[PDB]
Amino acid sequence: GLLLGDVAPNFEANTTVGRIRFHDFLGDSWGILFSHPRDFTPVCTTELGRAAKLAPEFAKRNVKLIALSIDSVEDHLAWSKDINAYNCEEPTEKLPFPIIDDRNRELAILLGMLDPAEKDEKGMPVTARVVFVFGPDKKLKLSILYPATTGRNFDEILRVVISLQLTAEKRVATPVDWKDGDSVMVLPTIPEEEAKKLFPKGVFTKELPSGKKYLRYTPQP
Amino acid sequence: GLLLGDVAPNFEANTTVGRIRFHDFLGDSWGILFSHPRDFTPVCTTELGRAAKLAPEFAKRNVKLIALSIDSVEDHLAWSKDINAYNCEEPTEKLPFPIIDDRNRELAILLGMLDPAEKDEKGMPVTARVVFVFGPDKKLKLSILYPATTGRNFDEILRVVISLQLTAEKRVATPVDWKDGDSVMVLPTIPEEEAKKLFPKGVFTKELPSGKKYLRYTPQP
């Protein structure tokens, strides 16, 4: 597995563009490493095709995507023609992000990207649907662990990406169901002095039974 | 850390409903064990308040929620009075769901819930925004890990529960960004003659440059 303070290992692995070092791939950009169970599968095809459409948005926001499965690069390159066909693009071998060959399930044990009750006909447990979000400083900023049966929300991946990019920029936080542009919460350890000088668009605090002044809203900084 | 197919640690803890045991709480019901940084916090107020409004839409689906902070049951109930006030109801120290006490931090280094950045006034790490979807078999079905800066989408936590429950009933899988009601995907293992009897509503296939027949859609069974 991997915890929120851990560092993405500079692992070496083979992809659809060749072998790479992890950190060297990222360098000074945010990284999204997501894994999918098998290639030539129906939900995975939707998932990786949804990604390929979102790669422009993830790009201009300084994020690099990269895929991973147990299937070979021989397949990855061929499946991309189907993935491209799904998106009604010209069925090339080229995707806007890479896919890692994890033939031997090395970094899938390293990172805990395994599945229960899912394996190949060869009798080997496959990947699951994980998404690791790393920051420019190579640390784990977020992670989700989804089942093989349950597909992922990529509109949710983009949402928390803007947050992580916003909450690190400003001394704010994003509440539940927060949509891009909605009001953010004021970090509760900030006094009304430094606060009003940070958010000139105003800080708005509700009053609650215990008379604490922590519930403070403010428009997007 | 924690992985999929791991039986939920049958712990005992003191809560806002008493000291109870984990499997004894759940019993035979799907369970969502979510955490939160700290009580009296602007984001976690939006969170737990949302979780209390959504509580019936979980129990309708046989899902009992339970929360967890590093705070005292005294601080919970005084905050639970501020929680219900957040959503404009009777400011009682009562919620739809138990909140777990974990000051001694036993369940936080065990479950991999510790947030790297955020800590309490004494220098000790506080919980992160973790969610543990456990099946009725006590085993882990889905997990998400979020920082204290970025707040969870509970509409999505509801999204995955519905799918986890359909996907354990019918032999399908939900694609990317799937909403309740929408068409699902047919499992790759299921051959052509079985896919007709299993799904009498039409099974529609996407023709792909590979030439295989995996990308098959079907109405929600």
Side-chain angles (χ1 to χ4, degrees), chain A residues 82 143 145 147 153 163 174 176 208, chain B residues 143 145 149-151 156 210 214:
Chain A
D82 280 29
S143 65
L145 222 325
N153 200 343
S163 170
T174 82
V176 275
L208 295 102
Chain B
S143 85
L145 252 86
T149 39
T150 284
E156 175 74 39
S210 75
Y214 57 80

Side-chain angles (χ1 to χ4, degrees), chain B residues 33 75 80 90 183 190-191 212:
Chain B
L33 175 78
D75 274 5
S80 287
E90 293 273 338
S183 330
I190 304 184
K212 303 156 175 282

Side-chain angles (χ1 to χ4, degrees), chain B:
Chain B
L2 201 56
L3 305 178
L4 297 181
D6 283 0
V7 169
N10 197 24
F11 60 81
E12 206 178 63
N14 227 93
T15 49
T16 48
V17 286
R19 177 127 195 154
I20 210 161
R21 213 77 128 272
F22 198 26
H23 298 183
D24 285 67
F25 168 70
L26 303 168
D28 291 306
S29 295
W30 291 72
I32 297 186
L33 175 78
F34 73 99
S35 71
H36 68 259
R38 191 92 192 270
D39 302 348
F40 304 111
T41 299
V43 181
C44 295
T45 323
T46 58
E47 288 212 351
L48 271 72
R50 172 70 190 169
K53 291 197 309 181
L54 266 204
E57 238 73 56
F58 280 101
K60 185 166 109 206
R61 290 183 158 86
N62 185 255
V63 179
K64 37 184 64 157
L65 302 166
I66 186 151
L68 181 136
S69 176
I70 50 105
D71 293 283
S72 0
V73 178
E74 172 186 334
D75 274 5
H76 290 343
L77 301 171
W79 186 51
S80 287
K81 285 186 80 78
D82 285 21
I83 283 293
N84 298 269
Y86 163 70
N87 51 37
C88 301
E89 298 165 351
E90 293 273 338
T92 53
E93 40 195 342
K94 303 192 89 195
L95 279 194
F97 52 90
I99 299 92
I100 294 184
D101 180 17
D102 212 36
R103 297 133 80 193
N104 76 129
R105 193 243 237 123
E106 196 186 298
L107 280 175
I109 39 90
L110 160 73
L111 289 173
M113 301 178 134
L114 284 197
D115 200 75
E118 255 257 357
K119 43 187 72 278
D120 60 79
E121 69 274 349
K122 309 173 191 302
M124 323 191 187
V126 294
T127 19
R129 299 180 203 279
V130 163
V131 187
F132 280 146
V133 178
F134 291 113
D137 43 336
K138 308 304 182 327
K139 303 170 171 268
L140 192 64
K141 280 299 168 291
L142 189 140
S143 85
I144 54 114
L145 252 86
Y146 284 64
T149 39
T150 284
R152 286 166 272 177
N153 191 310
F154 257 82
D155 283 352
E156 175 74 39
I157 294 180
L158 202 253
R159 208 267 268 152
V160 298
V161 158
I162 308 175
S163 168
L164 281 169
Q165 284 196 8
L166 159 59
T167 36
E169 266 296 284
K170 292 295 221 294
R171 296 190 65 188
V172 300
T174 76
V176 74
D177 311 343
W178 180 82
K179 304 186 235 69
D180 193 13
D182 306 351
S183 330
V184 286
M185 311 311 295
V186 191
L187 292 180
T189 35
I190 304 184
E192 333 86 352
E193 195 193 312
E194 196 175 4
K196 318 181 296 198
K197 247 229 65 64
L198 257 41
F199 318 103
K201 313 121 287 138
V203 277
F204 310 116
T205 307
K206 202 77 174 65
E207 304 288 332
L208 300 170
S210 75
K212 303 156 175 282
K213 273 98 187 315
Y214 57 80
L215 196 49
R216 314 176 284 181
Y217 298 77
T218 186
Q220 183 180 331

Side-chain angles (χ1 to χ4, degrees), chain A residues 43 47 129 146-153, chain B residues 159-160 163 174-176:
Chain A
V43 171
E47 261 177 347
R129 301 178 206 264
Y146 275 67
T149 40
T150 300
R152 243 140 27 174
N153 200 343
Chain B
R159 208 267 268 152
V160 298
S163 168
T174 76
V176 74

